[PDB]
Amino acid sequence: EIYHCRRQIKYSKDKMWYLAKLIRGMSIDQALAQLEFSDKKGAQIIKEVLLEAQDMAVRDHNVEFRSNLYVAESTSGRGQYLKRIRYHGRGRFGIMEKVFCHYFVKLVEGXXXXXXXXXXXXXXXXXXXXXXXX
């Protein structure tokens, strides 16, 4: 498995998670194209992370075929918070919290296989007949 991580980078975790779930389960190529033409602040960063992950995959692991690489797991954690003073009216100060995001990428070789297909009639006729016999 090929792991890559980026910490102490300042971006919205909730916003980066949008592009993080986007490439999860998807193949390297499709994820690359997506992140390239995806419009957001996380697009560039996650693109860099992916590119570095591919470079590490090729150089360190010495992978024979690049097409056998896909994205198995992607996650976004929260780092330290920078507290800033936001000046408001009537002599009151609010607390502006600048967040941070630690991006983690876990890659596994082999062809990507994901099936979300579920037959309704089969699952119903099986679960009902098994629940009636229990």
Partner 1 sequence: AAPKNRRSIEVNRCRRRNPQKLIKVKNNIDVCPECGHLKQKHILCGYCXXXXXXXXXXXXXXXXXXXX
Rounded least distance, CB 46 to RNA, Å: 12
| DSSP H or E segment with residue 47 | helix 41-59
* Binding of RNA by 46 (CB under 7 A): no
* Binding of partner 1 by 16 (CB under 8 A): no
Q: Which is nearer to partner 1, 1 or 29 (CB)?
A: 29
Q: At 107, which amino acid appears?
A: L
* Binding of RNA by 91 (CB under 7 A): yes
| Cα–Cα distance measured from residue 62 to residue 68, given in angstroms and rounded to the nearest whole number | 12
Indicate which single residue of 2, 11, 16, 19 sits in contact with partner 1 (rule: CB under 8 A).
Answer: 19
Q: Which is nearer to partner 1, 5 or 32 (CB)?
A: 32
112-117 CB contacts, 8 Å cutoff, 24+ apart: 112/25, 112/26, 112/27, 112/70, 112/71, 114/25
| Residues of the shown chain interacting with partner 1 in the complex, contacts defined by CB under 8 A | 14, 18-19, 21-22, 33-34, 36-38
